[PDB]
């Protein structure tokens, strides 16, 4: 049973107080003590906090827990920009008789200037029509923050079918990066007269519209 | 130095089995206790099993019960984890962990993990080594900001993961963009790679894109060439 349910987000500017809590039952922290994990995403995680409130030496004086009953708390006490790294409580379950992991909190740190898209959109390749096939790729680059939307149309009608859209990534351009991969017939293609990627990005839209008969 | 360091198993069939090792170093092994914890791509750590020091008892996650087994050669100095019955929710990152503690976690008391080591990646899918295909992206004449022009290559429908897409026998570098590929639908994959250059380069220069998908042994080079529509890149300089 995992309930460790922790906040999946939190911001905060450099230098601040930022809390992280986390509220499990009287079984896994009502009974054993919290641990908190570091965790670069995908990437081997590291002991941040023991014994509720512990630090393992080597961890910056500025990182405090606390327990509290059936529930326990991770305070960041001077908010650097390192510290966007993923956040896991956990606690040893004497119910379950298992290690109850959380559900993670990722520290975003809120400086950094609005990137915008930089959407760039390929047509079906002729070989590609050739094999029986249409393919619409839909690229979109140095954005930031990581939070796009990507919106298929076509003449002037939004379009979901075969649109298989990648989730924003993380390009060491320290922005954000996605693809979109809307799938047709080589028949439905040239049914229309134009479609677009329109991709919205903190308000603002961007298309780019692209045309089966280019020559023509 | 702690040293722990997973050996095991990548893409397997749902069904199939795998046997990840972990072999430590920097400590007395026989005196902490062992975790195997994983983590499915994009969501959190998962807790899967823990064995005492002595291997005198062990716990597994509901989940994984039954199928899994925590195994260790206090001997040898390695922690096992025997994964029968492979389904395809089984996917992730499987870490090797210590419990710092006095080599157990119980009522009283639970360390935790202090150490952890790496990960090993192992895939469970329903789904079988496909070559890519791939259909070069060519160059438009629209007229794009001034930002010039971009073109590229369609690696689609490809398995496993990775695919190596150097541009023109890698002499091309840092116009260059290769995309993180998108798990599709099919259970297979697609990238792509997108050379942005200057739309006056484009038609003196000869933009090749060398693909290579190892695992199915795939070498495909594409010529990347525009439009005949272009007649201000296809024509002769006049």
């Known amino acids: 049973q995992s309930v460790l349910t922790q906040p999946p987000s939190a911001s905060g500017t450099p230098g601040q107080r930022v809390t992280i809590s986390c509220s499990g039952t009287?079984?896994?922290?009502?009974?054993?003590?919290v641990n908190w994990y570091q965790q670069l995403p995908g990437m081997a995680p590291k002991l941040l906090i023991y014994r509720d409130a512990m630090r393992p030496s080597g961890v910056p004086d500025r990182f405090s827990g606390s327990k509290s009953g059936a529930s326990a708390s991770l305070a960041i006490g001077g908010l650097q920009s390192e510290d966007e790294t993923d956040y896991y409580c956990?606690?040893?379950?004497?119910?379950?008789?298992?290690?109850?992991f959380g559900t993670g909190t990722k520290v975003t740190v809120l400086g950094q200037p609005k990137a915008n898209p930089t959407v760039t959109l390929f047509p079906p390749s002729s070989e590609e029509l050739q094999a029986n096939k249409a393919t619409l790729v839909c690229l979109i680059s140095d954005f930031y923050p990581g939070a796009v939307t990507v919106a298929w149309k076509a003449d002037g009608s939004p379009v979901k079918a075969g649109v298989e859209t990648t989730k924003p990534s993380k390009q060491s351009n320290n922005k954000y990066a996605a693809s979109s991969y809307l799938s047709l017939t080589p028949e439905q293609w040239k049914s229309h007269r134009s479609y677009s990627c329109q991709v919205t990005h903190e308000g603002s839209t961007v298309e780019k519209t692209v045309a089966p008969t280019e020559c023509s | 130095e702690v040293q722990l360091v997973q050996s095991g198993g990548g893409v397997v069939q749902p069904g199939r089995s795998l046997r990840l090792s972990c072999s430590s170093s920097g400590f007395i092994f026989s005196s902490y206790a062992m975790y195997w914890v994983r983590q499915a791509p994009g969501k959190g750590l998962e807790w899967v099993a823990i064995?005492?020091?002595?291997?005198?008892?062990?716990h597994y996650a509901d989940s994984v019960k039954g199928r899994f087994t925590i195994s260790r050669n206090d001997s040898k100095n390695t922690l096992f984890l025997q994964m029968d019955s492979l389904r395809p929710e089984d996917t992730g990152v499987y870490f090797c962990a210590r419990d710092g503690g006095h080599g157990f976690c119980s009522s009283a008391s639970c360390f935790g993990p202090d150490y952890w080591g790496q990960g090993t990646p192992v895939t469970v899918s329903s789904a079988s080594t496909k070559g890519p295909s791939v259909f070069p992206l060519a160059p438009s004449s629209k007229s794009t900001s001034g930002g010039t022009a971009a073109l590229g290559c369609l690696v689609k429908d490809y398995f496993p993961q990775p695919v190596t897409v150097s541009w023109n026998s890698g002499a091309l570098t840092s116009g260059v963009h290769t995309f993180p590929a998108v798990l599709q639908s099919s259970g297979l994959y697609s990238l792509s790679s997108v050379v942005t250059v200057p739309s006056s380069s484009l038609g003196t220069q000869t933009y090749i894109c060398n693909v290579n998908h190892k695992p199915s042994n795939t070498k495909v080079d594409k010529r990347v060439e525009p439009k005949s529509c272009d007649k201000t890149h296809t024509c002769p300089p006049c």
């Open positions: 956990a606690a040893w379950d004497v119910s379950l008789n298992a290690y109850v």
């Open positions: 064995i005492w020091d002595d291997g005198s008892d062990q």
């Open positions: 009287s079984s896994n922290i009502g009974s054993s003590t």
